[PDB]
Amino acid sequence: HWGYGKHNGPEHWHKDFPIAKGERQSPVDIDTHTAKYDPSLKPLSVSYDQATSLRILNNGHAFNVEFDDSQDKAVLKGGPLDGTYRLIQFHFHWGSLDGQGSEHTVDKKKYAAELHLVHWNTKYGDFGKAVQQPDGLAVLGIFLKVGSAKPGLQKVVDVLDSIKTKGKSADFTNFDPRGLLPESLDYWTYPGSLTTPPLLECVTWIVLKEPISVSSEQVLKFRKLNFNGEGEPEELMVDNWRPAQPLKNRQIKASFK
Ligand SMILES: NS(=O)(=O)c1ccc(O)c(NC(=O)NCc2ccncc2)c1
Ligand SMILES: [Zn+2]
């Protein structure tokens, strides 16, 4: 099975998931000079006040903080989106070094990590149906650079010792995802895909211009996770990012000029 190693990493995924070579694959490089400012883009509406986190899970590729998505508690609307998308989970991708780790790049620049807040279009009833649809998901992507700590991330960092290995989960209630958001909600947007298998072309990507800063110690704790299950040989969970894919005939739009 697929992963991020030398024999099963991103360049291998197309053998099991042929859509890996598709027409709207993610991530991509965001060339900020070819991005098109679109005055008709609405501001993003992020309504996380009622969010209910439930638990945190090491799935062998990243860790997911999962939310109750059985009601409109934490929703994303506006921006390029029609209708309401519900937060189901967030996770991150990160590097072995501070100089790499993000999936999207900005003018070929790589950030230390990238946060994905995953939301599904409520008109499809649940996440499983939504991923089968071209407008099924909206993923809000936020870059992390290494600098000052992000206090709102610390509760995530502190529980990672409880989920070191693949398949481990821990109760993780009352986490407020608003503490992971940068000041500005200026964004780029383009149609794309999940960045891990099954690589389905179901995502409206919304990538924030402004990164959040996290401390070196915070991202180091990410790197102490393991891809392997307990009692298997230890392989650090680092470099769990897919590289940029061809833009093909897509234009990236910007909400700001
Ligand atoms: N990166 S993303 O484009 O925001 C994204 C958003 C929502 C997703 O459902 C996926 N993809 C998966 O969930 N794949 C199954 C899986 C992945 C990792 N480990 C175990 C199982 C990727
Ligand atoms: Zn992701």
From Swiss-Prot:
Active site: H61
Cofactor binding, note field: Zinc. Can also use cobalt(II) with lower efficiency, but not copper(II), nickel(II) and manganese(II).
Effect of E103 to A/Q: Strongly reduced CO(2) hydrase activity
Listed result of changing A62S: 2-fold decrease in enzyme efficiency, as determined by kcat/KM ratio, and efficiently inhibited by chlorzolamide
pH dependence, entry free text: Optimum pH is 6-8.
GO MF annotation terms: arylesterase activity; carbonate dehydratase activity; cyanamide hydratase activity; zinc ion binding
Site, as annotated: Fine-tunes the proton-transfer properties of H-64: Y4, N59, N64
Keywords: Acetylation, Cell membrane, Cytoplasm, Disease variant, Lyase, Membrane, Metal-binding, Osteopetrosis, Phosphoprotein, Zinc
Residues annotated as site: Involved in the binding of some activators, including histamine and L-histidine: Q89
Effect of H91Y: In OPTB3; partial loss of activity
The enzyme's E.C. designation: 4.2.1.1, 4.2.1.69
UniProt similarity note: Belongs to the alpha-carbonic anhydrase family.
Function: Catalyzes the reversible hydration of carbon dioxide. Can also hydrate cyanamide to urea. Stimulates the chloride-bicarbonate exchange activity of SLC26A6. Essential for bone resorption and osteoclast differentiation. Involved in the regulation of fluid secretion into the anterior chamber of the eye. Contributes to intracellular pH regulation in the duodenal upper villous epithelium during proton-coupled peptide absorption.
Name of this protein: Carbonic anhydrase 2
The organism's taxonomic lineage, starting at the top: Eukaryota, Metazoa, Chordata, Craniata, Vertebrata
